[PDB]
């Protein structure tokens, strides 16, 4: 993570798709290095089908430049997450900010 | 195989045997200069600062 | 660049420094003064040279 | 703002400290600026280029 | 030519301590303190985990189903496990655990010579009720930094495709600072003290450390004392 | 050739009708194989590994 | 946890005063840890016989000219700092330089004593100009361990035998290791100790301080 920064590092991390962003807020039901499953809050949830958002994380894989692009879960089991919160970091991102 | 004995033979073939070093925009004749090679671990060429 | 900044800092003199005024037989004991911590690197000093 | 954050740091305003050569264990004349600079590793890495 | 000897060795935390050397002549506090930091920070015996063989894991780049730690990351956590042995130069520690919650360093198999100085040290978490991790942690002992890279030259069929090597980070010493304060013995001209304040992972006792450090000093000087 | 042919008679080796095209790891780069994919022409029988 | 001892030690004598010892294969960073730790004890703390207090016959203060000698009194002192001697059973001996007549007054013109061994009899103390030119001084030599400047003291105490010590750590290749260090120790002395003896006794004293943690 950069110790000295500007404050854009969050925007660069999130707006680029390298990271995994919460679709809807709720509580984390399951956290694995593989996936992240969120129990949606009822205020944000549609009436039919109910739901939970199942986020499948990217694992070790080739980038165009032959670097490694791999995602990590940044939240822990059973923690409240709000819509538009960083769920998992991408390559060269820390707790949702941009660390190059 | 990079057998251990070969490194010492390489010091032999190197000892008195200059190598040419060259940089990118060769301008005057000094763009190529000969050096005596010294064996170095690592993938980098080391260049005398004065040159 | 680095090398000339060294020699510049080497042969230079401030107004008052450790060993100011003393005299030494030759460059040898001048270095012996400096490395040992007695005399400052730049101080006005008379030394015998050949 | 920076010097004041260094006050809260317990560290000098100068941004410079005393440093010792790890070889002689002796001091360095003058302060050297030490701090934390963010550094990137570009991918020109030598074992691609060689 | 009065020679020094030690004095109060003050343990402060399980981490660091301040040893002191009382009868030091002029300038010898620096001449030693610096000479001692050198052998202290560098050449000291230490034991760090090297080979880690995990359950169903083929390589360090996978994900174990049921743990939020990537295998590569669990290996890095093992490199920071501080341990100590006595009569073995390598002992293989067996870690087994299951159930939702952290797998700490206290969940390993105790051995006669195994002492885990940080039992709370987090090896990895466990995200599912039934998810179980078995691992063979092969800890050996050595000096310095032996990277995982130079380890795969001897090889000679380390076929165990499951056996992961990590980099040997072996060493107790972290940060050494030496400070020489003037020590007044009841009658003497001027003498100095030596405060060697060190910081450690707990796998070496301060006096022992400061001894084997100082041992090598004279042992290297041996040839030096002639030609 | 004649001298290669004598060589085969002494060491009694049957020289294959096949040339070695195998993909081997680029020189100096060393790593762990984390995956293998096998694409086969539609209509050729899929091999064991595939 | 087996460690590494040196080998080969070609000692290239330069003249008889100084020399370059060479020490091949040491482990990492030990070229400095040894080379620096010996440089320290060589330049500072050493057994030595230098000149300290000098009482000059005619003129009592340094701010004068002795009639009949072209060396300023200040300059005569620098020559004294450079007289190399050794005693045997005496911890201070006060000698006697006497001379007259046109010519150089060297260090062989002194009064010989049982324990005085003057390592440079050709060493020029000062010259003697026209006439007869009276010159005699009782030069008080004491013994000690290091370089004690005239300020803290009236000449500078030169007691170290060594004049200049420098060590260079160069890269040593062991048959199958990456990088090891070499140790090139180039030393210089006033002739009252040979480099080989000195470098022995320097490090001897080093380990003697270690005598409690061996």
Q: Pick the closest to residue F40 from F31, F29, F49 (CA basis).
A: F49
Q: Which residues of F touch E (CB under 8 A)?
A: 30, 32-34
C-beta separation of G159 from G147 below 8 A:
yes
| CA gap G57, G51 in Å, rounded | 17
Burial D25-39 (b: 16+ CB within 10 A, else e): beeeeeeeeeeeeee
Backbone dihedral angles phi then psi of residue E37, each to the nearest 5 degrees: -55, -40
Strands B32-35 and B19-22: antiparallel
| H/E stretch holding C7 | helix C2-10
D45: tokens are 């890495």
b/e map of C10-47 (b: 16 or more CB within 10 Å)?
Answer: eeeeeeeebbeebbbbbeebbbbbbbbebbbbbbebee
- Do D38 and A3 lie within an 8 Å CB cutoff? yes
Nearest to B42 by CA among G178, G29, D43: G178
Distance CA(E50)–CA(E63), nearest Å, equals 20
Helix H or strand E segment including G34:
helix G30-43
Which residue, among E188, E17, E32, D25, has the nearest Cα to G213 in the 3D structure? E32
Deposited experimental method:
X-ray
- Closest residue of G to C48, CA-based? G78
DSSP-assigned letter for residue G212: G
Contacts of G112 (CB under 8 A, 6+ apart): none
DSSP C4: H
**What region, left, alpha or beta, does residue E177 occupy, with left being phi > 0 and alpha being psi -120 to 50 degrees?**
beta
Q: What are phi and psi of F46, to 5 degrees?
A: -65, 130
Q: Chain G within 8 Å of D21 (Cβ-Cβ)?
A: no
Size of interface A-E (CB pairs under 8 A): 33
Question: Taking CB atoms and an 8 Å limit, are A67 and D43 in contact across chains?
Answer: yes
Comparing C-alpha atoms, which of G190, G181, G163, G214 is closest to residue G39?
A: G163
Q: If you compute the radius of gyration of chain B from its CA atoms, what whole number of angstroms results?
A: 14
* Stated resolution in angstroms: 4.1
Other CB atoms closer than 10 Å to residue G75's CB: what's the count? 14
Report how far residue E53's alpha carbon sits from residue G22's, in angstroms, rounded to the nearest whole number.
Answer: 47
Please, what's the largest Cα pairwise distance for chain F? Answer: 47
Q: How far is CA A80 from CA A25, A29, G63, in A?
A: 8, 10, 89
- End-to-end Cα separation, chain F, in angstroms: 40
Of chain A, the end-to-end C-alpha distance in Å amounts to: 7
Alpha carbon distance E108, E93 (integer Å) = 7
State the nearest Cα–Cα gap between D6 and chain B, in angstroms. Answer: 38
Non-local (6+) Cβ contacts of E131 within 8 A are E65, E66, E67, E98
For E158, list phi and psi in degrees, rounded to 5: -85, 40
CA angle A62–A67–A69, rounded 5-degree value: 60
DSSP notation for B11-45: HHHHTT--EEEE-SS--SGGGEEEE-----SSSPP
Cross-chain Cβ contact A32/E70 below 8 Å = no
Is the distance from CB of G202 to CB of G46 less than 8 angstroms?
yes
- What CA–CA distances, in Å, run from C50 to E59, E125, F46, G73? 71, 76, 90, 20
- For each of the domains in chain E, give its residue range(s) and CATH number, in order of start: 1-45+171-227 (3.30.1360.10), 46-170 (2.170.120.12)
* Apex B25 CA angle, B24 and B27, nearest 5: 135
Give the span between the Cα atoms of G185 and E227, in whole angstroms: 13
Tokens of E204: 């070496």
Sign of CA dihedral E177, E182, E185, E190: positive
Which residues lie closer than 8 Å to E171 by C-beta, 6 or more apart?
Answer: E44, E46, E48, E143, E144, E145
Q: Tokens in use for G87?
A: 């005693």
Contact between residue E6 and residue E207 where contact means Cβ atoms under 8 Å apart:
yes
């Amino acid at each position: 993570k950069p110790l000295v920064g500007t404050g854009m590092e969050r925007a660069v991390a999130v707006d680029s798709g390298v990271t995994a962003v919460a679709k809807r807020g709720g509580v984390v039901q399951y956290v694995d290095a593989s996936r992240i499953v969120i129990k949606v809050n009822e205020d944000e949830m549609y009436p039919g089908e109910a739901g939970i958002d199942i986020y499948n994380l990217t694992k070790y894989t080739r980038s165009n430049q032959n670097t490694c692009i791999n995602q990590m879960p940044c939240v822990s089991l059973g923690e409240p997450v709000e819509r538009g919160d960083v769920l998992a970091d991408g390559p060269s991102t820390d707790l949702g900010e941009l660390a190059l | 195989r990079e057998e251990a004995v070969v490194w010492d033979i390489l010091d032999e073939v190197i000892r008195e045997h200059p190598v040419l070093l060259n940089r990118a925009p060769t301008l005057h004749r000094l763009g190529i200069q000969a050096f005596e090679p010294v064996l170095i671990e690592g993938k980098a060429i080391q260049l005398h600062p004065l040159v | 660049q680095d090398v000339v900044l060294g020699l510049y800092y080497m042969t230079r003199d401030c107004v008052n420094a450790k060993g100011e005024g003393m005299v030494l037989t030759g460059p040898k004991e001048a270095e012996r003064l400096y490395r040992s911590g007695l005399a400052s690197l730049h101080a006005r000093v008379k030394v015998r040279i050949t | 703002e920076i010097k004041e954050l260094l006050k809260l740091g317990d560290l000098p305003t100068s941004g410079q400290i005393r440093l010792y050569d790890g070889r002689t264990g002796e001091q360095f004349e003058r302060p050297v600026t030490v701090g934390y600079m963010y550094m990137l590793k570009l991918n020109h890495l030598v074992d691609d280029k060689m | 030519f009065l020679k020094p000897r030690l004095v109060d060795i003050e343990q402060v935390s399980s981490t660091h301590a301040k040893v002191t050397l009382e009868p030091l002549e002029r300038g010898f506090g620096h001449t030693l303190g610096n000479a001692l930091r050198r052998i202290l920070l560098s050449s000291m015996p230490g034991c760090a985990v090297t080979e880690v063989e995990i359950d169903g894991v083929l390589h360090e780049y996978s994900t174990k189903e049921g743990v939020q730690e990537d295998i590569l990351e669990i290996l890095l956590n093992l490199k920071g496990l501080a341990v100590r042995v006595q009569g073995k130069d390598e002992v293989i520690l067996t870690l087994n655990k299951s159930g939702i919650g952290p797998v700490t360093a206290a969940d390993i198999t105790h051995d006669g010579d195994v002492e885990i100085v940080k039992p709370q040290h987090v090896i990895c978490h466990l995200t599912d009720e039934n998810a179980s991790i078995s691992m063979r942690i092969k800890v050996q002992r050595g000096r310095g930094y032996v990277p995982a890279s130079t380890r795969i030259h001897s090889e000679e069929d380390e076929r165990p495709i499951g056996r992961l090597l990590v980099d040997a980070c072996y060493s107790p010493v972290e940060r050494i600072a030496y400070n020489v304060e003037a020590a007044r013995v009841e009658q003497r001209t001027d003498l100095d003290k030596l405060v060697i304040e060190m910081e450690t992972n707990g796998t070496i006792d301060p006096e022992e450390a400061i001894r084997r450090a100082a041992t090598i000093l004279a042992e290297q000087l041996e040839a030096f004392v002639d030609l | 050739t004649p001298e290669e042919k004598l060589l085969r008679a002494i060491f009694g080796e049957k020289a294959s009708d096949v040339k070695d095209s195998s993909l081997r790891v680029p020189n100096g780069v060393s790593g762990t194989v984390i995956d293998v994919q096998v694409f086969t022409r539609d209509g050729v029988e899929k091999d064991k590994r595939a």
